[PDB]
């Protein structure tokens, strides 16, 4: 299937 978004934050 389609796009999978990650969750972006400050490391």
């Amino acid at each position, epitope marked *: *299937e*389609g*796009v*999978v*978004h*990650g*969750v*972006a*934050t*400050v*490391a």
Partner: nanobody
Amino acid sequence: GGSVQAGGSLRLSCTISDAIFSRYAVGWFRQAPGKECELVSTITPDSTTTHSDFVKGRFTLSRDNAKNTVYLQMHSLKPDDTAVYYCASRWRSVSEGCGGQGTQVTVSS
């Protein structure tokens, strides 16, 4: 999100579906205010990393050794790096890469 003065550094983290992390390239994308989404860099499960032309060695990618996280290490940040940064896999266009939960990066002069 992270905010720095010009010349500074900032490390971002992207946690993404484990099934995806194990099998697919993960892309970092960014979108500056009033501008379109653009692809920044990618990293594969074997830690092959690609970069767009505007990176010029300043941003590097790595995968965590234990968890489903990819890191974007940024150095020598400039005000024009101010943007919301995002990560995604299996995108059908670059526009899709900025559709998820992003983090605001602000670089002040």
